[PDB]
Ligand binder design. Structure first.
Ligand SMILES: O=C(COc1ccccc1P(=O)(O)O)NC1CCCCC1
Ligand SMILES: O=C(COc1ccccc1P(=O)(O)O)NC1CCCCC1
Ligand SMILES: [Cl-]
Ligand SMILES: [Cl-]
Ligand SMILES: [Cl-]
Ligand SMILES: [Cl-]
Ligand SMILES: [Mg+2]
Ligand SMILES: [Mg+2]
Ligand SMILES: [Mg+2]
Ligand SMILES: [Mg+2]
Lengths: 228, 228
């Protein structure tokens, strides 16, 4: 449905929809921009990420409320409506995974872009894993694992330890370990190594870079405090 | 699309969607419940009101952001996207007005229901008036006026001055006068008379009724403070 709108108009309207807190419209404008087939700039990558994080964040928070109600219940209404929200959540994750696979990841040759999109692929399989059950759940967990691992390998080879994309990848992969993979020690180890390596690289940064890096380091510290 | 769901299941799912902060789903479930054709209980009236107030509240807040950006601008994108949001806002107001007219108002014989639905009819024409221009704007303002006035006449004949529905009607009609009709003195007069008449009736109330009434009296006082 965004096929008739210019790419630059879609980007401009995504920024307006962000100002208006209309994140479903923001996601649909960024989906249309990706579908134009050109690579995304750094600014455009971040618009894409912000739009879908907020859309899925609404759905995950709802699914959590409904799942809690359902667990306490244990008529069909609670389960039906939890299933409705779950399906729409899965559809959002599938849409994002579809954009990554057609064809954002394959055309991303620079480290900053390739790590960004692989971390997104890990995050959206992780959201699928949160609602999954059984050994359907297993292949989804492994897919999230694989994406984060490929991003980590690239990030370690190609980015400094203070790069905010590298930091946020490590933060989300530590949450995957803690929340999804039942590997709290791996979680803690990753978050502590990441924090310590970044601290030792801070001296290299300008004032503005320092503020960007240390903000994500504080998120790593807040988790280690929650986890230990 | 809610035609196949039982009325009681629609009400139960509206309450769940409220807990999950999913107000578009809440509105669609309550729309489906009204469309069953039976009168609404007091609790159900309030579910209907909460669902649509939140949906339209999102849209009005967005429209305000975009209108402000557009005014400062004065390409087509800002205007196009403001128009997109405006159209969806108008469609929500038309849907609510449609439910009131088919056939909630005509079947509402008790004062508490009839005043509730007429105040809703005033509020949703008032939201239409906020985005309207010219002398299209005039007939819409007059429609909001007419609905509030009919509700006020009934409320004064049939409800005590502390009844919370009567208070909230007077509060919203005073906002209509101040914001839409360019009649700040009428606004102030209404809000002060309403506050004073309720204060003199408080002695008749139980503890719980007193808390309900005085909460809306504080909203009247907060406006008089803003307006004087
Ligand atoms: O409270 C959190 C914290 O989650 C994270 C913390 C650190 C890194 C990544 C995440 P997320 O699980 O949101 O990707 N997330 C909420 C989960 C419910 C939906 C809104 C966001
Ligand atoms: O800040 C207000 C105060 O508006 C009122 C105050 C008293 C009575 C009725 C209203 P409203 O105009 O929301 O019906 N309203 C916001 C207007 C922007 C959209 C969300 C609500
Ligand atoms: Cl449902
Ligand atoms: Cl490539
Ligand atoms: Cl548009
Ligand atoms: Cl009647
Ligand atoms: Mg073009
Ligand atoms: Mg390339
Ligand atoms: Mg039935
Ligand atoms: Mg009747």
């Amino acid at each position: 449905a965004m096929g008739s709108m210019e790419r630059a108009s879609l980007i401009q309207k995504a920024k307006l929809a962000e100002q208006a807190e209309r994140y479903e419209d923001m996601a649909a404008f960024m989906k249309g921009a990706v579908e134009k087939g050109e690579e995304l700039s750094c600014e455009e990558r971040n618009l894409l990420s912000v739009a879908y994080k907020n859309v899925v964040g609404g759905q995950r928070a709802a699914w959590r409320v409904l799942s809690s109600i359902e667990q306490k219940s244990n008529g069909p209404e609670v389960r039906e409506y939890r299933e409705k929200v779950e399906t729409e959540l899965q559809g959002v994750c599938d849409t994002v995974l579809g954009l990554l696979d057609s064809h954002l990841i394959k055309e991303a040759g620079d480290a900053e872009s390739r790590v960004f999109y692989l971390k997104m692929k890990g995050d959206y399989y992780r959201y699928l894993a949160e609602v999954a059950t059984g050994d359907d759940k297993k292949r989804i967990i492994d897919s999230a694992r694989s994406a984060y691992q490929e991003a980590m390998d690239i990030s370690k080879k190609e980015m400094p330890p203070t790069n905010p994309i590298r930091l946020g990848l490590a933060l989300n992969f530590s949450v995957f370990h803690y929340e999804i993979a039942n590997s709290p020690e791996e979680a803690i180890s990753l978050a502590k190594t990441t924090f310590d390596e970044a601290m030792a690289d801070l001296h290299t940064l300008s004032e503005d870079s320092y503020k960007d890096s240390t903000l994500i380091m504080q998120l790593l510290r807040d988790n280690l405090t929650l986890w230990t």
